[PDB]
Specification:
With 331 residues, the protein is α+β, with helices and mostly antiparallel strands. It folds into 2 domains: 1-81 and 247-308, Periplasmic binding protein-like II (D-Maltodextrin-Binding Protein, domain 2), CATH 3.40.190; 82-246, Periplasmic binding protein-like II (D-Maltodextrin-Binding Protein, domain 2). It is built from 11 helices and 14 strands. Strand 1, helix 1 and strand 2 (33-39) form a beta-alpha-beta unit. The longest helix is centred in the first third of the chain and has 16 residues, at 9-24. The protein is globular and about 60 Å long. It binds fe (iii) ion. Residues 60, 121-123, 246 line the site of fe (iii) ion (FE).
């Protein structure tokens, strides 16, 4: 009863190893176990699982779309939840963080340098670019090029740096792993902090995860859709959108989902939020959001009938779909 977890590169690899070793000490020998398979990007993890080389990997809802597509055909099986065990949230808010006093508003993002969690991810890409692409007087709608031209240099992890070097200007190569310091929610944040980009498309918990003190966080703001700015504390009324939970995907058939649930259930039971000091499934000295998001507080089993589209919902799938085809209101 072994679940082959897909770690994306070194840090994740290291956490996966500790995840395997610590589970071995709390799970009876006849229980689920963790086998660590290391890959270079989430995409490879998707391909590996589809090829029956790995069994599970956690993906942002946006990337759940990709995993679904044939010949992958993966499905969401266990979702992460946030907030607290006492008030679980299977969603989060996409926010546009900026430094206080940088002056620009949402409508003045053109020519700025942007930091994205990753190409095709909910908060760092789908939401912001979605609300942006069609308003573009410019019909360079094959997205990447249009975005590369809209902003004056960015970091969009997993974007093809060869065709669009503009998209990797802030993080040369657009590394698609935590080895790239500007990867993910917190990487995109560092990109802003360091002053490499003017804005960071991340989530409502991101700043709180990186800045322990209100005084420092006070030097940042959120860009609201009505072209005004709000304090990072007020994301409820200043966020770009509410997006679905990141989730663990598996093969639609022979995915070992049940075994996956067990592993993760028992895992949260022993090393969930604030359970143990010897191991934390939701944090690591090796980095942020390795394997699972630090903001997650546990997991929820996805209903058996749910395929990726039912999970993402009609509007999001349609949006992602139009996004990738540049389908815009009118034509
Ligand atoms: Fe996300």
């Amino acid at each position: 009863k072994t679940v082959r977890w897909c770690a994306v590169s070194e840090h994740e690899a290291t956490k996966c190893q500790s995840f395997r070793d610590h589970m071995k000490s709390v799970i009876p020998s006849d229980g689920p176990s963790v086998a660590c398979v290391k890959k270079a990007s989430y995409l490879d993890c998707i391909r590996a699982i589809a090829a029956n080389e790995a069994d599970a990997v956690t993906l942002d809802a946006g990337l759940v779309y990709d995993a679904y597509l044939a010949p992958n055909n993966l499905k969401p099986v266990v979702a992460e939840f946030y907030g607290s065990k006492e008030d679980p949230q299977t969603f989060y808010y996409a926010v546009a963080v900026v430094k206080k006093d940088s002056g620009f508003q949402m409508n003045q993002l053109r020519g700025k340098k942007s930091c994205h969690t990753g190409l095709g991810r909910s908060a760092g890409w789908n939401i912001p670019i979605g609300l942006l692409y069609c308003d573009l007087p410019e019909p360079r709608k094959p997205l990447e090029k249009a975005v590369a031209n809209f902003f004056s240099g960015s970091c969009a992890p997993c974007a093809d740096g060869t065709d669009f070097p503009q998209l990797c200007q802030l993080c040369p190569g657009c590394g698609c792993s935590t080895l790239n310091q500007y990867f993910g929610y917190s990487g995109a944040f560092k990109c802003l902090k360091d002053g490499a980009g003017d804005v960071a498309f991340v989530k409502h918990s991101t700043i709180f995860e990186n800045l322990a003190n209100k005084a420092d966080r006070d030097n940042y703001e959120l860009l609201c859709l009505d072209n005004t700015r709000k304090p990072v504390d007020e994301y409820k009324d200043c966020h770009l959108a509410q997006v679905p939970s990141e989730t663990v995907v598996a093969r639609s058939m022979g995915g070992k989902e049940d075994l996956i649930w067990e592993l993760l259930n028992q895992a949260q039971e022993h090393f969930g939020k604030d359970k143990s000091k010897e191991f934390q499934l939701f944090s690591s000295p090796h980095g942020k959001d390795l394997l699972f998001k630090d903001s997650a507080h546990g997991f929820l089993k996805v209903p058996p009938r749910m395929d990726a589209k039912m999970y993402l919902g009609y509007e999001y799938v349609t949006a992602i779909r139009n996004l990738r085809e540049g389908t815009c209101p009118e034509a």
